[PDB]
Amino acid sequence: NGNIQVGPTGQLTIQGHPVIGEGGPITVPEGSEITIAADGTISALNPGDP
Amino acid sequence: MISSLWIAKTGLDAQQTNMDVIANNLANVSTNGFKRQRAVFEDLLYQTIRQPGAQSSEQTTLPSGLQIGTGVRPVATERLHSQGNLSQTNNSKDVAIKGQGFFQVMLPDGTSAYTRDGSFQVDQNGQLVTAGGFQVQPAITIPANALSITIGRDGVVSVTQQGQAAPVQVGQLNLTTFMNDTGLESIGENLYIETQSSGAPNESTPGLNGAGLLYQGYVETSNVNVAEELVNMIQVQRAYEINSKAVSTTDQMLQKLTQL
Amino acid sequence: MISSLWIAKTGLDAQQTNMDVIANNLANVSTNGFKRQRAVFEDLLYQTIRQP
Amino acid sequence: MISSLWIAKTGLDAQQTNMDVIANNLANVSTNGFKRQRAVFEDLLYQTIRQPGLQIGTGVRPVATERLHSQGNLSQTNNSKDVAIKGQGFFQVMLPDGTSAYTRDGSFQVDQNGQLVTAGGFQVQPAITIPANALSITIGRDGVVSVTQQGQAAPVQVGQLNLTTFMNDTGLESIGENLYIETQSSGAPNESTPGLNGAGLLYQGYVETSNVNVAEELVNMIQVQRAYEINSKAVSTTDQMLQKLTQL
């Protein structure tokens, strides 16, 4: 199930289970347009900034 | 109800607005001191979807993602403040501006507007007023038994009385110039009111600082070029037809989606 | 129904007024003590969709 | 019975309301001084299901239609009795029962004993009594109605056409025949002379046409038809699902 949701504090959870990356569970910069590449690279864009 | 239909609606609205601009320019061909308008359009929103520049494959970025855009919106209509052709009517009261100045007129409510139409009249009290009855500034007053009125190229006004071989100056007609002439708000009746985007009124007598020179017996005709208007008709019609074709295609797609 | 239609309709009335003035001026060529007419036009309403 | 029939029924009713608004806008495309209507849809209550988080909708319901009070185009009537308004303002017209309504249709007539009345015959206040032997009626920009008589070289002042301005023009109650009455959402009718205190000017010989744009109505009709078809399909799907359930 690849339906990933972003928590209020930026934790990536699938069905309430915190997703685990190469360094453990992922902490996303609170509020960000997450883009996942073809191999799993996560890019975060913060609102307002360029 | 569907995105393509909203985009086509915006396109139809833009082309319609272009048609209103064309029709307004055409209706005022015979208007003295009229300036033709041109509308400017801009792109509407662009849905981000795939972000262009986001890193795919750790070391390769994604160029030019899905920037799905919405329709079009008109930015603003800008007047073309150019010198209209001068027409000779052989009248003592018609004044034409050849440069970049405006006449100042007082509305009876207290404020002042600015007009370029130079067809002036005299009220029952002898004041120089506009054809709509608005009293031009300054309140140049003309004597009762006037034989000839001479408005010079420097804006000076002289009246030739009987028994006096020397004309007597009865006023001084000034021109108002602005930093930005497109920012004046047109209120109709060939009148512009000053806005904050048009700076502040700069008084200057005709011939110095840039104010134009005043010609007597001439009127500044409208600068509307009509063949350009006809060519713009042809486009404003095809573009509207093509946008309606897009509406029809979206309608057919939705109809087949519904019928299944 | 369409604003452009109304604007053209007025323009047509204005040009018809000009034509009538010209015709009246030409009809009175041989009359003594006649003063030819001349029509003056002005801008109608201005819709302020976006305030300048 | 819990089902999705009601949710799609609300959708059908909303599309019906939108189509009624569109048809009303199109039918009044020839009325003088008519403001187009737009219906605002805003959804119903939500039912929340608690986990050991999710909210299911119920449908859509019309809330309130707004009349667009933009200045319509002017049309030339060549009648000296017709006046159009340049700006925001309303003519005050006295109904027979005694309460004063407010109209923007500027097509007026003179009744059998003087008096300026609307097309429906209701008197325009203040009482502006036109003399019988009047040669020409002139209504100025600032609402001064002057009357010329044969002989006298000066026009005679008869009355002032005052404009009633509301702070909220949308909240007036449309009573029917091109008349609005003040309401709690459009209170404090402010009487003013035309040209001051934000009141509009008067053009004599012109009438203010309707505000209905045509392209919006036609494309909105297309959208309403297609959304109605979609909701009908949803109703049919729910019907088939219930039919399959009952046959067990």
Side-chain angles (χ1 to χ4, degrees):
Chain A
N1 170 284
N3 170 264
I4 307 179
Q5 293 284 130
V6 156
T9 179
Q11 318 266 294
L12 288 175
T13 89
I14 290 139
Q15 293 210 181
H17 306 295
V19 198
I20 304 204
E22 307 179 355
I26 308 170
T27 44
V28 163
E30 309 176 302
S32 47
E33 281 79 1
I34 297 317
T35 305
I36 299 173
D39 46 53
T41 308
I42 294 177
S43 308
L45 187 73
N46 266 25
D49 310 329
Chain B
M1 91 162 312
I2 192 73
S3 73
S4 37
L5 196 59
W6 306 106
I7 301 177
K9 275 169 100 204
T10 57
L12 290 174
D13 295 0
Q15 301 293 345
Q16 165 65 16
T17 291
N18 226 338
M19 189 63 213
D20 302 70
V21 164
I22 291 172
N24 184 22
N25 288 342
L26 286 177
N28 294 23
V29 166
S30 207
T31 282
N32 284 355
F34 180 69
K35 308 296 184 202
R36 74 151 191 61
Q37 280 210 339
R38 207 190 52 112
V40 181
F41 302 105
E42 75 200 38
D43 282 313
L44 265 192
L45 294 199
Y46 274 81
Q47 304 177 3
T48 57
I49 325 289
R50 327 199 71 231
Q51 170 80 8
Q55 291 265 359
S56 180
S57 317
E58 95 177 357
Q59 45 219 176
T60 83
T61 62
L62 165 76
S64 95
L66 263 281
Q67 288 272 349
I68 304 175
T70 55
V72 60
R73 150 184 94 146
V75 202
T77 72
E78 39 120 358
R79 264 191 311 300
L80 163 73
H81 281 284
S82 83
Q83 162 71 55
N85 281 335
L86 300 177
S87 169
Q88 173 143 20
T89 76
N90 273 20
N91 272 48
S92 48
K93 314 263 191 53
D94 303 318
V95 188
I97 322 181
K98 192 201 181 177
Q100 273 313 340
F102 290 102
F103 297 115
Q104 181 179 6
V105 160
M106 210 149 274
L107 293 169
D109 86 86
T111 89
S112 38
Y114 307 94
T115 179
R116 169 157 279 233
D117 183 317
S119 179
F120 297 123
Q121 295 203 290
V122 169
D123 60 349
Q124 71 274 0
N125 294 307
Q127 311 245 296
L128 265 196
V129 313
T130 314
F134 306 109
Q135 295 206 180
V136 187
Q137 300 306 118
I140 317 286
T141 309
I142 299 182
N145 63 317
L147 299 176
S148 74
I149 305 163
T150 296
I151 301 170
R153 290 172 91 292
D154 265 319
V156 311
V157 183
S158 308
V159 177
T160 310
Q161 308 262 42
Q162 173 84 90
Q164 293 144 50
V168 282
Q169 165 157 355
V170 304
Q172 212 295 332
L173 211 74
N174 286 315
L175 297 176
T176 313
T177 167
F178 300 102
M179 181 85 258
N180 164 292
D181 308 3
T182 43
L184 322 173
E185 187 176 328
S186 317
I187 57 176
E189 311 169 359
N190 284 354
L191 294 170
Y192 307 108
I193 57 172
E194 153 206 28
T195 67
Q196 95 174 346
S197 98
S198 86
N202 286 337
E203 211 98 11
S204 311
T205 191
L208 290 97
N209 294 173
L213 300 139
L214 303 172
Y215 282 96
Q216 191 168 6
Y218 289 103
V219 281
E220 173 175 351
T221 60
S222 84
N223 49 353
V224 178
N225 195 353
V226 186
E228 180 182 353
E229 304 288 340
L230 285 165
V231 178
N232 286 333
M233 301 215 198
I234 296 189
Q235 320 188 239
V236 163
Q237 180 175 188
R238 293 313 165 184
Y240 200 106
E241 290 186 356
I242 290 174
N243 294 28
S244 99
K245 285 305 160 181
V247 166
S248 270
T249 303
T250 303
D251 211 5
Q252 304 233 349
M253 277 198 337
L254 278 180
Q255 150 153 60
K256 165 81 51 163
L257 207 52
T258 56
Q259 83 164 100
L260 283 184
Chain C
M1 43 274 294
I2 289 330
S3 184
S4 100
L5 188 71
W6 301 111
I7 302 176
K9 289 182 58 178
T10 58
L12 285 173
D13 312 278
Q15 299 293 348
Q16 169 83 49
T17 292
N18 259 344
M19 192 86 248
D20 283 349
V21 163
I22 297 304
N24 180 246
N25 293 164
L26 273 175
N28 283 128
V29 163
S30 276
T31 84
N32 293 359
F34 182 67
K35 308 296 184 201
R36 76 196 156 106
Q37 321 167 79
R38 156 193 185 181
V40 284
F41 303 98
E42 64 196 298
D43 285 343
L44 265 190
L45 297 194
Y46 263 109
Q47 308 250 8
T48 175
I49 292 132
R50 307 191 70 225
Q51 183 86 16
Chain D
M1 23 148 70
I2 283 188
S3 48
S4 321
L5 272 184
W6 300 129
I7 310 181
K9 202 193 74 29
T10 72
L12 294 172
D13 290 0
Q15 304 297 343
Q16 290 284 357
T17 294
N18 202 2
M19 171 59 76
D20 304 323
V21 167
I22 294 169
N24 174 67
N25 288 345
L26 285 180
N28 302 325
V29 86
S30 51
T31 44
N32 294 302
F34 177 70
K35 303 303 144 185
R36 47 141 277 241
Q37 248 175 299
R38 191 189 98 69
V40 187
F41 299 120
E42 141 184 354
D43 61 355
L44 270 150
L45 300 176
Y46 273 30
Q47 150 198 7
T48 305
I49 297 190
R50 78 284 91 181
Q51 300 159 357
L54 59 159
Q55 285 158 58
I56 321 194
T58 313
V60 65
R61 63 183 244 68
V63 202
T65 68
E66 322 161 354
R67 324 191 281 290
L68 170 56
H69 283 277
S70 325
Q71 171 98 25
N73 291 316
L74 307 176
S75 48
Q76 196 167 46
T77 175
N78 301 301
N79 196 3
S80 58
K81 324 248 191 210
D82 305 0
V83 283
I85 280 177
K86 151 176 163 60
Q88 42 211 298
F90 287 114
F91 293 112
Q92 184 173 8
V93 152
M94 184 195 118
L95 287 177
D97 51 51
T99 196
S100 37
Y102 304 98
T103 183
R104 212 150 189 244
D105 191 3
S107 98
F108 299 119
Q109 283 153 30
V110 52
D111 74 12
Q112 73 284 2
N113 53 336
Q115 262 63 9
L116 243 194
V117 298
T118 196
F122 316 124
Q123 295 202 321
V124 186
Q125 33 190 358
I128 296 172
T129 301
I130 296 177
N133 314 346
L135 263 203
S136 294
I137 311 98
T138 82
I139 300 169
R141 154 161 91 71
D142 49 48
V144 174
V145 179
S146 42
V147 163
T148 302
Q149 277 135 290
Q150 163 153 300
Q152 337 169 4
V156 181
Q157 218 289 16
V158 181
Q160 175 95 2
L161 270 157
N162 293 322
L163 295 184
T164 295
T165 80
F166 300 99
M167 157 198 325
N168 163 267
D169 292 335
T170 314
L172 290 63
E173 188 118 341
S174 311
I175 78 164
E177 69 224 340
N178 281 333
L179 298 167
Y180 311 122
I181 50 176
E182 92 152 306
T183 315
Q184 219 69 32
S185 42
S186 78
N190 284 286
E191 185 128 345
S192 322
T193 85
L196 326 161
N197 304 6
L201 320 187
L202 300 173
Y203 281 112
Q204 195 212 0
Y206 291 72
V207 317
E208 178 177 354
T209 37
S210 61
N211 201 10
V212 175
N213 185 11
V214 167
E216 204 171 357
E217 308 288 345
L218 285 175
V219 193
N220 282 341
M221 269 154 56
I222 286 174
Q223 317 198 333
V224 165
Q225 182 188 354
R226 257 62 185 189
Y228 194 85
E229 287 182 10
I230 300 279
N231 288 335
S232 278
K233 177 78 172 169
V235 159
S236 172
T237 312
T238 300
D239 191 351
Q240 302 203 230
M241 291 195 328
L242 270 283
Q243 196 178 161
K244 194 42 151 73
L245 190 40
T246 56
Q247 294 182 1
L248 300 191

